[PDB]
Design a protein around this ligand. Structure first.
Ligand SMILES: CO[C@H]([C@H](C)/C=C/N(C)CO)[C@@H](C)C(=O)CC[C@H](C)[C@H](C[C@@H]1OC(=O)C[C@@H](O[C@H](N)O)C[C@H](C)C[C@H](O)[C@H](C)[C@@H](OC)c2coc(n2)-c2coc(n2)-c2coc(n2)/C=C/C[C@H](OC)[C@H]1C)OC
Ligand SMILES: Nc1ncnc2c1ncn2[C@@H]1O[C@H](COP(=O)(O)OP(=O)(O)OP(=O)(O)O)[C@@H](O)[C@H]1O
Ligand SMILES: [Ca+2]
Length: 359
C-alpha cells in the first residue's frame, strides 16, 4: 500500500516508492517501433527502431505513448499493481489545466489507482533542499524553468521558461564534433556525445578569459576514449557547449540566458520577498550538474542584483534526483494524506476535482 512517486521527464522517468531515498527505476522516456518497446528496451535495440518522445519540453504531448511509459513503470520496472497504491505524479511549471486533468483521468480510468496527486517539479526540488521559500532553476533534458516559491507555493506569474536544456546541449556538441570531422549521427552516436558532454564539459567563470586560455595553452584539453578505443580530444568545446545556457545565441535562439531569466523572475516577485529568493537559489536537474555552474550563476546574479544582497546558490549533490526526492518526502508526510485525490472524490466531481486539490 506504499505510495508511488513517478517523476515524468522529457528525457528520463524517475520512479519509485514514497519514503525511499532514491528512485528504484530510472529509464529513458522513449517509445520505440521497428509491437512497441519502452525505455531501456528501446535504447538497447539501437538503429532499427525509430523513437517517439511522449514528453516534449516537460509537457506530456503524446498521451497514448505516455500510457505505455506509465504501464512500463508500474508493471516492468516497479512490479506493482497500480490499484493498490496512491500515486504522486509530477508536472512541469505552467502545465495546462487540461493536461493535469488528463493525467488524473488516465490514472483513475486506465490504471484504477485508489488515489493520486500531481505536484509541480520545481516545487518538489525546493522541498528536497529543506526549504519552502526560494527560487529554483530546474534544467533537465528538454526544458529549463525559473520558479520562485513562497511559503511552499509557486508564484505562477513570475515563472520563466527556456526551451533550451540538455538535449540541445548534446545536439550542439554533436554539431561541433561533426564539423571537426567526426561521425556522430545515429542514436547510439548521440549516446556517445551525451557521455562526452557529461564527463568533460564545464561552465567557465569568465567565458572570454577561458577562451583566451584555451587559445594560448593546452591546459584545458581533455581526452575521451570512444567505444572502439580511438581517442578524441576537446578543449574549448568543453565550456562552449554549456555556455549556451548563458548565451542562447550560440544555437541561434533569441532568448535571455538562465542568469537573466533567474533575475527577471525575481524581479517579477514582490520586493519584500526578493531578499529571501536571492539567498535561496536552488539548482535542480541534470543540466545543472556542470562543474562551475553554481559559481557562474553566483557571479552573474551578483552583477545584476542590488549591492550587498546576500546571493546564495545551493547546488545539492543529489540534484539529478531532487524532484523525485521531494515527491518521496511530500507523499510520506502525515499532513499530506488528506491531500490525495481519492477515487471516490473523482467519481463525485469528475477529473476537474484536480483544480481544487492540486496546482
Ligand atoms: C504538505 O504540503 C504543503 C502544501 C499543502 C502543499 C503545497 N504544494 C504542493 C504546493 O505546490 C507544503 C507547504 C509543505 O508543507 C511541504 C513541506 C516539504 C515537503 C518539506 C517537509 C519537511 O521535509 C524536509 O524539510 C526535507 C528535508 O529534510 C530535512 N529534515 O530537513 C530534506 C533534506 C535537507 C535532505 C535529505 O535528507 C537528503 C536529500 C537525503 O537524505 C538521506 C534524502 C533522500 O531522500 C530523503 N532524504 C527522503 C525520502 O523521504 C524522506 N526523506 C522523508 C519522508 O518523510 C520525511 N523525510 C520527513 C521529514 C521531516 C521534515 O521536517 C524537517 C519535513 C516535514 O519541507 C521543506
Ligand atoms: N553530469 C552531467 N553534466 C551535464 N549534464 C548532465 C549530467 N548528468 C545528466 N545530465 C543531463 O541531464 C539531462 C537529464 O536530466 P533530468 O533527468 O533532470 O531531465 P528530465 O527530467 O528528463 O527533463 P526535463 O526536466 O527537461 O523535462 C540530460 O540531458 C543529461 O545529459
Ligand atoms: Ca525534470
Amino acid at each position: 500500500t506504499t505510495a508511488l512517486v513517478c517523476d515524468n521527464g522529457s528525457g528520463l522517468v524517475k520512479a519509485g516508492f514514497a519514503g525511499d531515498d532514491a528512485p528504484r527505476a530510472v529509464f529513458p522516456s522513449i517509445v520505440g517501433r521497428p509491437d512497441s518497446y519502452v525505455g531501456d528496451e528501446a535504447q538497447s535495440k539501437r538503429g532499427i527502431l525509430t523513437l517517439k518522445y511522449p514528453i516534449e519540453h516537460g509537457i506530456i504531448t503524446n498521451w497514448d505513448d505516455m500510457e505505455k511509459i506509465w504501464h512500463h513503470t508500474f508493471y516492468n520496472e516497479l512490479r506493482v499493481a497500480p490499484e493498490e497504491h496512491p500515486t504522486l505524479l509530477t508536472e512541469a511549471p505552467l502545465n495546462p489545466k487540461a493536461n493535469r486533468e488528463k493525467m488524473t483521468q488516465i490514472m483513475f480510468e486506465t490504471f484504477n489507482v485508489p488515489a493520486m496527486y500531481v505536484a509541480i517539479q520545481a516545487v518538489l526540488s525546493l522541498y528536497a533542499s529543506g526549504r519552502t521559500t526560494g527560487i529554483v532553476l530546474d534544467s533537465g533534458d528538454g526544458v529549463t524553468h525559473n520558479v520562485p516559491i513562497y511559503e511552499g507555493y509557486a508564484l505562477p506569474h513570475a515563472i520563466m521558461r527556456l526551451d533550451l536544456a540538455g538535449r540541445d546541449l548534446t545536439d550542439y556538441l554533436m554539431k561541433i564534433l561533426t564539423e571537426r570531422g567526426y561521425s556522430f549521427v545515429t542514436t547510439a552516436e548521440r549516446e556517445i556525445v551525451r557521455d562526452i558532454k557529461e564527463k568533460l564539459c564545464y561552465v567557465a567563470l569568465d567565458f572570454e578569459n577561458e577562451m583566451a586560455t584555451a587559445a594560448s595553452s593546452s591546459s584545458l584539453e581533455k581526452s575521451y576514449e570512444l567505444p572502439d578505443g580511438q581517442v578524441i580530444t576537446i578543449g574549448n568545446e568543453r565550456f562552449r557547449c554549456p555556455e549556451t545556457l548563458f548565451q542562447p545565441s550560440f544555437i541561434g535562439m533569441e532568448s535571455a540566458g538562465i542568469h537573466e531569466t533567474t533575475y527577471n523572475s525575481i524581479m517579477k516577485c514582490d520586493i519584500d520577498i526578493r531578499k529571501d529568493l536571492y539567498a535561496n537559489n536552488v539548482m535542480s536537474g541534470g543540466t545543472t550538474m556542470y562543474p562551475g555552474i553554481a559559481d557562474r550563476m553566483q557571479k552573474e546574479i551578483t552583477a545584476l542584483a542590488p549591492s550587498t544582497m546576500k546571493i546564495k546558490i545551493i547546488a545539492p549533490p543529489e540534484r539529478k534526483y531532487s524532484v523525485w526526492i521531494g515527491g518521496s518526502i511530500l507523499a510520506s508526510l502525515s499532513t499530506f494524506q488528506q491531500m490525495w485525490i481519492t477515487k471516490q472524490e473523482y467519481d463525485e466531481a469528475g477529473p476537474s476535482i484536480v483544480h481544487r486539490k492540486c496546482f
